Amino acid sequence: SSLHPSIPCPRGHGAQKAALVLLSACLVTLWGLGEPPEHTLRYLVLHLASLQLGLLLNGVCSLAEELRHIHSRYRGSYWRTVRACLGCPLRRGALLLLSIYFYYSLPFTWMLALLGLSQALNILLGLKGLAPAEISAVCEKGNFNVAHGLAWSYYIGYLRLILPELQARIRTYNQHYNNLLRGAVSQRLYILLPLDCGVPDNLSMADPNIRFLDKLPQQTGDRAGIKDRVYSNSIYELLENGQRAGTCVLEYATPLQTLFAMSQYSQAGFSREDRLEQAKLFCRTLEDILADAPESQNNCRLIAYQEPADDSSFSLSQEVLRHLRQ
Amino acid sequence: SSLHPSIPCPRGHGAQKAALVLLSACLVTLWGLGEPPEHTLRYLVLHLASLQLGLLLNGVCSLAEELRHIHSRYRGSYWRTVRACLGCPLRRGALLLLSIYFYYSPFTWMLALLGLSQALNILLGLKGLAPAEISAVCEKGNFNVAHGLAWSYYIGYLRLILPELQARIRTYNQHYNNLLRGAVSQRLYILLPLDCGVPDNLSMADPNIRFLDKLPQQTGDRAGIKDRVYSNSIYELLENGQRAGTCVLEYATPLQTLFAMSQYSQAGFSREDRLEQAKLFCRTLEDILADAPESQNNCRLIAYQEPADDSSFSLSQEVLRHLRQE
Amino acid sequence: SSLHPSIPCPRGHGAQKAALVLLSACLVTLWGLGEPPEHTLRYLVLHLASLQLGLLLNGVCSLAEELRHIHSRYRGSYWRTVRACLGCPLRRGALLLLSIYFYYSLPFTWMLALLGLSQALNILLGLKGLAPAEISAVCEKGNFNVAHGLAWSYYIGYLRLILPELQARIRTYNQHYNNLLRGAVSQRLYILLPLDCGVPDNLSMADPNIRFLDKLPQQTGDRAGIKDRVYSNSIYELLENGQRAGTCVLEYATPLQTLFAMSQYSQAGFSREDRLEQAKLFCRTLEDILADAPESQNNCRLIAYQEPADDSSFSLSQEVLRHLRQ
Amino acid sequence: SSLHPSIPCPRGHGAQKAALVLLSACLVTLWGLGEPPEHTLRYLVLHLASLQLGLLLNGVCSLAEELRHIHSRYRGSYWRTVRACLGCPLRRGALLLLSIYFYYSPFTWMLALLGLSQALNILLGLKGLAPAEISAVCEKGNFNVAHGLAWSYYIGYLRLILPELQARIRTYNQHYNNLLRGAVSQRLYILLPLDCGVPDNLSMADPNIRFLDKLPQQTGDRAGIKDRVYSNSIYELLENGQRAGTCVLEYATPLQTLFAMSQYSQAGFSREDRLEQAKLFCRTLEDILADAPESQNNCRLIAYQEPADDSSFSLSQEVLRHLRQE
Amino acid sequence: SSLHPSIPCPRGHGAQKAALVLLSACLVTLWGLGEPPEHTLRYLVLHLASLQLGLLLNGVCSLAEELRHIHSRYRGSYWRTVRACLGCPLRRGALLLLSIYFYYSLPFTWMLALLGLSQALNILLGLKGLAPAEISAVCEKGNFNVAHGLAWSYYIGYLRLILPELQARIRTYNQHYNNLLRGAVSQRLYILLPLDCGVPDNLSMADPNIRFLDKLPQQTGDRAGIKDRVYSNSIYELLENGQRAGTCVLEYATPLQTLFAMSQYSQAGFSREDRLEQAKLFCRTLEDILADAPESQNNCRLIAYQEPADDSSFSLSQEVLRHLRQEE
Numbered sequence A, C: 001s002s003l004h005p006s007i008p009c010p011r012g013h014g015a016q017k018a019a020l021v022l023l024s025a026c027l028v029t030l031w032g033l034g035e036p037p038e039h040t041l042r043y044l045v046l047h048l049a050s051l052q053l054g055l056l057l058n059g060v061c062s063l064a065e066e067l068r069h070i071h072s073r074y075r076g077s078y079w080r081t082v083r084a085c086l087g088c089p090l091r092r093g094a095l096l097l098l099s100i101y102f103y104y105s106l107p108f109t110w111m112l113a114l115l116g117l118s119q120a121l122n123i124l125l126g127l128k129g130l131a132p133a134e135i136s137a138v139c140e141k142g143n144f145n146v147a148h149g150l151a152w153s154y155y156i157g158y159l160r161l162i163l164p165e166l167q168a169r170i171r172t173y174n175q176h177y178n179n180l181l182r183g184a185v186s187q188r189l190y191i192l193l194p195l196d197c198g199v200p201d202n203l204s205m206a207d208p209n210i211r212f213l214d215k216l217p218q219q220t221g222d223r224a225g226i227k228d229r230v231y232s233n234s235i236y237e238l239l240e241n242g243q244r245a246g247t248c249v250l251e252y253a254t255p256l257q258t259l260f261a262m263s264q265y266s267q268a269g270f271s272r273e274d275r276l277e278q279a280k281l282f283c284r285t286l287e288d289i290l291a292d293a294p295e296s297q298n299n300c301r302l303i304a305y306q307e308p309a310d311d312s313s314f315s316l317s318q319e320v321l322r323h324l325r326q
Numbered sequence B, D: 001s002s003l004h005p006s007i008p009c010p011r012g013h014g015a016q017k018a019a020l021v022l023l024s025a026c027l028v029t030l031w032g033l034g035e036p037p038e039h040t041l042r043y044l045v046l047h048l049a050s051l052q053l054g055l056l057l058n059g060v061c062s063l064a065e066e067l068r069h070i071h072s073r074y075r076g077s078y079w080r081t082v083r084a085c086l087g088c089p090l091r092r093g094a095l096l097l098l099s100i101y102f103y104y105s106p107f108t109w110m111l112a113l114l115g116l117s118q119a120l121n122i123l124l125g126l127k128g129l130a131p132a133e134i135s136a137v138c139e140k141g142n143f144n145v146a147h148g149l150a151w152s153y154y155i156g157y158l159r160l161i162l163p164e165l166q167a168r169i170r171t172y173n174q175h176y177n178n179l180l181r182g183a184v185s186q187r188l189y190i191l192l193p194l195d196c197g198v199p200d201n202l203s204m205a206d207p208n209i210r211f212l213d214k215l216p217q218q219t220g221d222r223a224g225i226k227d228r229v230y231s232n233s234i235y236e237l238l239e240n241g242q243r244a245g246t247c248v249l250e251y252a253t254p255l256q257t258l259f260a261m262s263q264y265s266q267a268g269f270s271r272e273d274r275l276e277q278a279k280l281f282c283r284t285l286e287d288i289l290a291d292a293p294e295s296q297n298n299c300r301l302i303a304y305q306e307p308a309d310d311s312s313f314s315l316s317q318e319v320l321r322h323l324r325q326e
Numbered sequence E: 001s002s003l004h005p006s007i008p009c010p011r012g013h014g015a016q017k018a019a020l021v022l023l024s025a026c027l028v029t030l031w032g033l034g035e036p037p038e039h040t041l042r043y044l045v046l047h048l049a050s051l052q053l054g055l056l057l058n059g060v061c062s063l064a065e066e067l068r069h070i071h072s073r074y075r076g077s078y079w080r081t082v083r084a085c086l087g088c089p090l091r092r093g094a095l096l097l098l099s100i101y102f103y104y105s106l107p108f109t110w111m112l113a114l115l116g117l118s119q120a121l122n123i124l125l126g127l128k129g130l131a132p133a134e135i136s137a138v139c140e141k142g143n144f145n146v147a148h149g150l151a152w153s154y155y156i157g158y159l160r161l162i163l164p165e166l167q168a169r170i171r172t173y174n175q176h177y178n179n180l181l182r183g184a185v186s187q188r189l190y191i192l193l194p195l196d197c198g199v200p201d202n203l204s205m206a207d208p209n210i211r212f213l214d215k216l217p218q219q220t221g222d223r224a225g226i227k228d229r230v231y232s233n234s235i236y237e238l239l240e241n242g243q244r245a246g247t248c249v250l251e252y253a254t255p256l257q258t259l260f261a262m263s264q265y266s267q268a269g270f271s272r273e274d275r276l277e278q279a280k281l282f283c284r285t286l287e288d289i290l291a292d293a294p295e296s297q298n299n300c301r302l303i304a305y306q307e308p309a310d311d312s313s314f315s316l317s318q319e320v321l322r323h324l325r326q327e328e
């Protein structure tokens, strides 16, 4: 939200207000007409009970398929494999008893046969699907994305490991290896987030002004059974109108390159328009992660930019220098 | 279906078979009863029309939410919003027209009742999804963290280190490794525990694993980072105090990420989800490496489960077993 | 209440005055309408009696579960099991007998079945819960917080042990070890309570002026099976506009660090919006405890501060000096 | 569940089973009696609506108290106060609007009676909670003293000293310990008396306990204090006057805090609450240490209950047993 | 309770069971006669309302006096006086407001005048008093006894100060001045609790077989502005049929001497039956206090004895001797 305006805000409570308005409208419409109050209640109760009897058939149909993986997903317990499909077997049983009592006392098997036939037609023809705007809410409320996992892996593997040790290297470099004639490299490690999934291997391209300057001292650790895992960084110069203007550290994000490469392979099943919404979500998730980390923005900065379609004299140098202003 | 018996198989079509059995039973029961089919046809058409109108009302209520995110999610276009909320404007309109044309088969009273019921369902949250259906749609649409983690792993590590492993092994064996020392074999062995407990070093939890020597590095450039390094390790296997063989051992860092996500509260990632994604990650790697150009001829996958009773389980014996049939 | 304006005051009697106003209004309304005064009394009695016959059903439903932990919670007493669920078994028995007499003489079996259905549906569907502002009163009236235990632990373990002997160390240091060139360290050990639970390890950070000077002679004791438990403190200087202003003894409060760290683990079940309410309650409990302690405020000072979000030129040195003025 | 049989198990689902049995009996009784179901539906709906109106009136009465803490507890917002007192404004509004519409199934007279009865309940204190319901809500929501104490213990002591215990023990054995003296085993032993009577030194309560020597210290910086120190001890176990072995012993200090909280009158802490919290603290530590990375492989828990008849209970045997099956 | 059979046990719930039996009998009797339940309920309501209106008049009469000590007992607040006299002003106000409505709709000023006369006659004549068996109940419930204060004073002033150091004092006396030729002084200080409050000054009297041998090393402390307060004890020996049987550390209980001496002065207002009532409650409270103290029963416990009415050759030497036997 605060990085770039095109980042969507989290979904809120907007359907509920529309539901309230619709409820009030239908209630006043019922009041304006002539019909007994008891008949409306009875019909509403029957409709509600039918909508609940229409889910047990779907649950049994789903169980008829889920029972084949009892030894692979539900250990060996029938209680778990029935709880995974038919909600909770305690509320559901009472609801079933009440529904059958209200449906049997108020041609009885005819309705059962018709409900079964309708449910079978719905499940076979596939009429009961999910809208694209509802999947995007169910898979975002429950964290069912790829960007969430990528952001958490990035944080855990890189930021939780180099950020505390960042100052101890730059401070030593600025005195031992950096000449007093050259300006000292700035703090606040900078990460660039191109909202296009285009991550060049080298930073020299796409901007003829930034040039590779020097190295940084490396650090060593033990991870996942492999020792001497070396982390190294680099420093780039900023040439403004042909003359040096400042120095900093520029970083891309490898997960963006991974998202870009996913859209090309056929086995991935990743569409071209998915790697854009995931790219948008990744930045928000990473910013949220960094907001409350103990190693806060005191050592890092984020830069998000969208490449103009008309090439309105856009240059990375202007953005990075404007960031270096703060 | 070969790495471990506990890995589940993809879902089949048992739901369709259960649906067909239910449809046959309903048709037989209706045939047994005495009634003309015209009434059944009329009632089925009315039920389908009611379901269509309910879906339309639900979509209309949902439309009130995404209209505030139009400038960021769906762009300034007013058509993509309705296309996402509904799915197909033309088909939806045709279906609505067909459904409302059969009103001749107190007319607004039914519409008011349907609206009232739909608003109640929206407000009270009675239209939730069982976990067995959420998992099904997520697996169908590739909405798992494990899928993204596996693809990132394959693109970033295996696709870069697999081709050069043979050359590195041969050069190490010729230049440094002696004839007295057992020659390091090919087919890099990857350890994939289905518990996500990844120790920092292999020396612990197995006294018979000892570090032997390192291996030459490799240099590359990625995401603007100059001179990215990669490293490996060589470990020796001891059998009753005597050496039995030598190979190259590795864990899976994404398993470490999956384990670490479950402890933080901001990740919102549970404990059983850890096991389920752990089991799915190995399946995804097997599927990806099944037809990868750098196929299984260059690396082997080992999946093991720690026994609950701790019946003297040794990883050295496990890896030696796969070493025998190398 | 006197530390910071943000600290809440104890809950009082406002619900009682609102209840009195509602009682008067409803009494006047009843007087203004036309109905026999006997009917009002009879209906009020019947309502009050049904609300008491509807509590034994809940009590028995609870006692169906409380009898499984008899040997582990209630020794072996059937009398003490029914005393934890059903209040007191004498007043309750008399109330039951009177309720039956009143409800039986004023289709009697019909009402019992309806009460049973209503109570069972309340228990199953969960319609009878607690608002967040009634739990917050019932668990604060009876001292059911985390901050209560943490504050009493802090007192008992630290301040009941070091405060009385704080004079005999400062006095010895000031004259044997403190040079006459340096100003004497002031009395009244100062405690900082950040209402953010963000507790840095070293005091040099977060304010570039306070700098570590030296230590104090330590004291020892034997506690809980460990002998020679060591307590030590430290002395900090306050540099004003480049020059020294005074000296004091500075401490954070470690239970705040515990409250912060609890909110990041997943098994804690302790939210990010809770460790601010508890942080504001811990300070109140400490102030109340130290108000009446014999080792009173003549030896310690409390400083509560909330970090501005806009960075309104806040410096801890200014607040510490302001309190040192007195 | 293994530490001692007296430790309770977490609450299950007996209330729901009893509720189902009660609902089934009520439904069967209603079927046995002769009456149309429409009356049952009407009366059930009316009862539920009256309950909802009563809850709303109670919420409005409670709102008269939380509006004088707006600038301290709920921030400058008027919506959080209502959300806390009521719970869900949109759902509450829908439920109220649907509830009052069913009055058509002297109308202000019933509202006056409901208000009068609710005011009587508030004033006279007739809606209190039995202790076995307060206990249930507290244990569900983690509103215990022992929860905070156990998490404080784990974060402040064990998570800091457990990794280095092996190194300290090994250095003590190599540098100082002789071969003639028995080797001190691993696995720091923690005694958890479920009586909160913690003696100052173990030389009392068992003549067979003799202090042998100390262990090398540990040093760190925490909360602005320079060089906090940690220390442990080594004890010798005598069998019939002869040495049998050695171990590293400790009590649990939070038990001492729990005991000392119950003597003061300001704490408001009873003498049965002490035993309940003491038996809950052990359960919480066992849960925490079950899945920690520094698991039970470095420490052991010993819970013992002092016999009432004093049947010659010797703590040395209790320690020696676990030493045997180490 | 377990100290002597004569010590009473705290009151429980017998009035409540009698109340349930009475309630059930009254309910059955009402069911056994012909009368509409409407009358049976409205008469009960009127009875309760009249009782509440009477309580308020009594409270106002009391407030007319309690408002005079306003600057001495209730600081300066007109509201704490009302809180002390008339219970709680909100519940009481609600009960008033509800009581009027039922008693005004169900000759209305006449009944108010009759209630006023009845309440004034009760206050003046004194018909409403308290039986001596419920004053005792409320005093014992709220801890309004002389013996409560005396027992807590005894504990806090003496035992909490000397019990921990008794072991060191005994040990030093044993290795320094005590010879192994004689019996070593046993541990576990013994306290005698005569339930007659007759405490003689010197233990040599009232039993010729108790003779005083030696003192004990002193203990010194500072208390309440007095420098160097000192404590000392004495050691006694028990002679069996002319032969020494053992050695103990004997003591009476001084608060018993205070309870006895308080009953001779006429200004104290302390009777001779009250002395016996309090002497059996001081022991109960002291044992309850010593049961849950860290300086527990391992350092000392009590010995209660009642002098026989017939004087059947009592010998407290036998009692202390048998306690010595049961110690081992």
Ligand SMILES: Nc1nc(=O)c2ncn([C@@H]3O[C@@H]4COP(=O)(O)O[C@H]5[C@@H](O)[C@H](n6cnc7c(N)ncnc76)O[C@@H]5COP(=O)(O)O[C@@H]3[C@@H]4O)c2[nH]1
Pocket: A153, A154, A155, A157, A158, A226, A229, A230, A231, A232, A251, A254, A255, A258, B152, B153, B156, B157, B225, B229, B230, B231, B252, B253, B254, B257
């Ligand atoms: N700028 C930069 N410098 C680094 O050294 C570095 N190392 C990792 N990263 C990125 O942070 C995250 C950490 O990945 P993780 O360890 O969880 O899984 C890693 C790991 O399983 C494997 N892998 C990558 N590099 C190595 C390596 N040297 N050794 C072993 N495994 C490796 O491939 C996965 C993804 O790596 P990248 O897809 O290139 O980007 C990573 C990743 O997004 C780095 N980014």
Ligand SMILES: Nc1nc(=O)c2ncn([C@@H]3O[C@@H]4COP(=O)(O)O[C@H]5[C@@H](O)[C@H](n6cnc7c(N)ncnc76)O[C@@H]5COP(=O)(O)O[C@@H]3[C@@H]4O)c2[nH]1
Pocket: C153, C154, C156, C157, C158, C226, C229, C230, C231, C232, C251, C254, C255, C258, D152, D153, D156, D157, D223, D225, D229, D230, D231, D252, D253, D254, D257
């Ligand atoms: N600044 C500072 N210096 C101290 O010496 C100190 N000692 C205690 N405290 C804090 O006061 C309270 C009393 O500690 P307690 O013994 O009751 O529980 C302690 C105790 O059970 C255990 N523990 C801590 N330090 C030791 C220690 N050296 N040895 C044994 N156990 C220890 O871990 C619990 C929590 O310790 P902290 O969470 O770091 O904060 C403590 C605590 O809140 C201190 N605070």
